Design a binder for this molecule. Structure first.
Ligand SMILES: NC(=O)C1=CN([C@@H]2O[C@H](COP(=O)(O)OP(=O)(O)OC[C@H]3O[C@@H](n4cnc5c(N)ncnc54)[C@H](OP(=O)(O)O)[C@@H]3O)[C@@H](O)[C@H]2O)C=CC1
Ligand SMILES: NC(=O)C1=CN([C@@H]2O[C@H](COP(=O)(O)OP(=O)(O)OC[C@H]3O[C@@H](n4cnc5c(N)ncnc54)[C@H](OP(=O)(O)O)[C@@H]3O)[C@@H](O)[C@H]2O)C=CC1
Ligand SMILES: NC(=O)C1=CN([C@@H]2O[C@H](COP(=O)(O)OP(=O)(O)OC[C@H]3O[C@@H](n4cnc5c(N)ncnc54)[C@H](OP(=O)(O)O)[C@@H]3O)[C@@H](O)[C@H]2O)C=CC1
Ligand SMILES: NC(=O)C1=CN([C@@H]2O[C@H](COP(=O)(O)OP(=O)(O)OC[C@H]3O[C@@H](n4cnc5c(N)ncnc54)[C@H](OP(=O)(O)O)[C@@H]3O)[C@@H](O)[C@H]2O)C=CC1
Lengths: 266, 266, 266, 266
């Protein structure tokens, strides 16, 4: 269009920039460590939250608790992120029940570790790519229509240090490549969607979660590589999700927030 | 050690993590666009602010206004950042006056554009390195002592997109290299101050300040490179400075926050 | 077992380091611009070459021309890279016909451009990931066995500037993702395969092949962004492939060679 | 509209691309491990070489021996890279004695290690910056004139993994930041000089030279971080320097060749 494009009117108050009042956020892996923490940050900011889950229990009860706690709307939705159909239906259910969708957090993830050789099953590769990469694309694709119609939107993917670093001692090229794919996929989206949305990623290091250090051997690697000598606590991501989800970050697009206690420094 | 290092207690509330109450932040370039915006964010979070300036007028008046606005202590200090003695003295004055120093924001910057050839004065090169790079080292060196004695601290340097990309059409290798040096200097400090401080950088794209686009030619490059088709407003750096300065970001260290409206996506 | 690992015995002659005498190289996209250029480089260096193609015509005669021109063995193999069985069968045919496999160049690529939209078919996404990413995984999976049996190998993937920047004016997140994925997949393999092989990528900018600038609007961007103001000529990639394929690069692993005429600088 | 710019004269033979016959290369740190290896690669390719040294003994003999060995012209020059006049004096002498200057390799380096705190002398910071960063600027400044007159040139800086990662266990933010500075300074020159020169860097990991692993604690870090479990041998750099100095790399500008045995992967 004509240049320069309009600078938005912006709150004089930094805390007001963080407000999620009147805004709707959907979060996959909603029942998990990072996902629920993000939900708590956003619910505290006054935002309504859709918690998307697959196998997590008590989600209706956990939703009701979060809603009561913060005085916002929280509803849980079953969503199998490897299935486009399920990803789409969850998004359209959120749009229908809430009236809009301002933020999608593609936070569900997983995969299967292993060296690359003929002992690595072909399905292990594709399940891994499906859960981290294809899932993000299925969500983005459908969000694109909502965000374009609203003229606004914020897409966040939870990536990993594995997108830029190679995990040791348990090789996992599949998971590493799938997360790197997401990082640059989101960057491409930031340009693609420049007229109606921002797109950013958060790359956590090791966090105290069921997806954190699997055993003593990875813990020992963590204590050496993390300059802080410890795994993160999920509260330490809360502000970063809220930062990207809100008007705190209206000039932040195509960015990857590295929250890793210095893991990637050495 | 031992390992794991202890987690740091954090409030249950995401907004309480941003609180700067009881904490002291010193900010060079404190009379300037980005530096005063940062000061406003920190004062809003209840933090005390030392405003470090060189030639900016009415700093005593502007400091008192900010103090009254937010109900915090604000005091200005003359500091020439290319002189280690001036940098050291301002740091020691704030330490003496406020009793502590929790966050130093190495935000002052400048330099001289020009192609690298025999018409580029040696002093231009050295003034540019002094104002961006040496200044930061001078600050870090004296902050190290205070942070180590406190066992806590947050060091922030304002870098630039110029640390990772090359500006056009006006060549400025000196400025670009000086900002790249600061980004990795800071990354080096994050490992080095491990036991007592976090250190991070904020890399703005072009912002509407006296250091924003030189002329129409730079403007035209910005309008097509930035996917948002405009320069930033310093309000949109505010939340990022507070993020890093506070307990919002306790597992964030060695990071470079890119806030560039997509300039670097390409 | 113990450290340090043995330093390889190497020629005093730098030109001898480039020799591909007694080495077998397999190259997907072998009938294409970049792939045949690399074949010419390796044939000249005295290497035997397996040319892997899908639809390219006259491959038996082109192979014959190359073999005669350079006095090496050259054979063509039909290989559809989106299918694991065809990738594996080609690799195993080469191993049998040539007796060994020293270097594999995962050079075939493609994809479907387009904005991420409900108008972007799921099939287009998966076709794009298949030809660039899955293909590379399928080759690597099978090479791992040969390479470790041998105690040596060099895996090379042709990536793109699209791995690290986003292409304009024609959005293509699928392709950009898939190439980013390959870059870090190869980095993960470099660690994975550390005892028996080296793994590196070459990321070309725009080159004059059928995969080069698709129209005048892409050309105009290229002229602005490449500091050299032109597309590459495939001869300008030849040395980089020979460098990685040979003993010229025995301490080079996990690297991404950017050959882009400065496309990524600004 | 002089776009597109003509593609240079490109040898059809990959080995002819590496030829340095009729080309003059000046190498600081010429008496050192990497520098002399670079000189041998370039002498073998038929290039004339100026060995620039500060304190290295027997340089007149070592030059004469390299010249006789390869049948090229080799001369030595006393050059203190921290002083602009000495850098310029050596450049102008080379130009006068050899007639030309096609390639400058800013290879000299050093510095003083240490944590950043009041015990790190201001002089130590400035020495470190001078030897790595300012030296490179001093060379570039004067090379620009020669390259402009020639319409051609290849500027190479020897950087380090330290430009991209943080060394451990012995902190060295000064050295790290200076090297990072040089990487992006070079990237900036690649654009600046785009009409008459190419500009690239080579980032070695630890190599077996007096600037290699200082003690067994560094060695132990090296053996666990580099996937090849050993320090580099200087022969393993030769081909990379030749690659950048010659027509092997005519579309390669603004690139950083990482040659680190995978040190930066994990
Ligand atoms: N913790 C760590 O050390 C790190 C984590 N990450 C990333 O953070 C994200 C969240 O993980 P985290 O909270 O740590 O761990 P959790 O195990 O607590 O959460 C992971 C979530 O992924 C969901 N999930 C997995 N597969 C599917 C699927 N097929 N369909 C729908 N949901 C699925 C799970 O849902 P459910 O339980 O309902 O089945 C679960 O809630 C992941 O993307 C992970 O890759 C990145 C770096 C580090
Ligand atoms: N605006 C932009 O587009 C971008 C700016 N930046 C960086 O942001 C930072 C702040 O600049 P910004 O706020 O935009 O512009 P301003 O011009 O408003 O601020 C620049 C500040 O630097 C101070 N300064 C310059 N030289 C010295 C010196 N020798 N000693 C002490 N102070 C000095 C000035 O202080 P005083 O007036 O008191 O002399 C001034 O406050 C700089 O580091 C700049 O490099 C990075 C990317 C983009
Ligand atoms: N040219 C450019 O500007 C750039 C190209 N690249 C990459 O370089 C590589 C080579 O392309 P380039 O030489 O430029 O272009 P070409 O079109 O000349 O060659 C591309 C090759 O890809 C092969 N191919 C495509 N799909 C398949 C498939 N499904 N199975 C087997 N082979 C397949 C084609 O084989 P066939 O014809 O036999 O069917 C063809 O030989 C690609 O990976 C591309 O992504 C990267 C950056 C820039
Ligand atoms: N070896 C390694 O592990 C690594 C080395 N590097 C870099 O490689 C480059 C070469 O080092 P390398 O060959 O390994 O080690 P050497 O010690 O063999 O070489 C270092 C060279 O730098 C020269 N030098 C130092 N200070 C000055 C000065 N003030 N003026 C002129 N010359 C000076 C020395 O010259 P003289 O003897 O004549 O005084 C010497 O030839 C350096 O830039 C270093 O930073 C980068 C990564 C790793």
């Amino acid at each position: 269009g004509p240049f320069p494009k309009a600078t938005p009117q912006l709150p004089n108050s930094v805390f007001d920039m963080f407000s999620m009042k009147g805004k709707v956020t959907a979060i996959t892996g909603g029942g998990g460590g990072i996902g629920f923490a993000a939900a708590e940050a956003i619910a505290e900011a006054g935002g309504d939250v859709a918690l998307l889950y697959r196998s997590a229990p008590n989600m209706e009860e956990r939703s009701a608790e979060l809603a009561k706690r913060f005085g916002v709307k929280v509803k849980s939705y079953q969503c199998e992120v490897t299935e486009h159909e399920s990803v789409k239906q969850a998004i359209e259910a959120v749009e229908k029940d809430f009236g809009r969708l301002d933020c999608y957090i593609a936070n569900a993830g997983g995969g299967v570790p292993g060296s690359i050789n003929p002992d690595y099953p072909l399905e292990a590769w594709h399940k891994t790519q499906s859960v981290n990469l294809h899932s993000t694309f299925y969500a983005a694709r459908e969000c694109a229509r909502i965000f374009k119609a609203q003229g606004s939107g914020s897409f966040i993917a939870t990536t990993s240090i594995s997108a830029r670093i190679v995990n040791v001692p348990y090789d996992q090229p599949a998971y590493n490549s799938s997360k790197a794919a997401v990082v640059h996929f989101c960057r491409s989206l930031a340009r693609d969607w420049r007229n109606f949305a921002r797109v950013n990623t958060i790359s956590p290091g090791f966090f105290d979660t069921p997806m954190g250090p699997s055993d003593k051997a990875v813990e020992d690697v963590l204590y050496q590589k993390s300059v802080l000598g410890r795994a993160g606590d999920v509260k330490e991501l809360k502000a970063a999700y809220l930062y990207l989800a809100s008007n705190a970050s209206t000039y932040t697009t195509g960015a990857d927030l590295l929250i890793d206690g210095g893991y990637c420094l050495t």
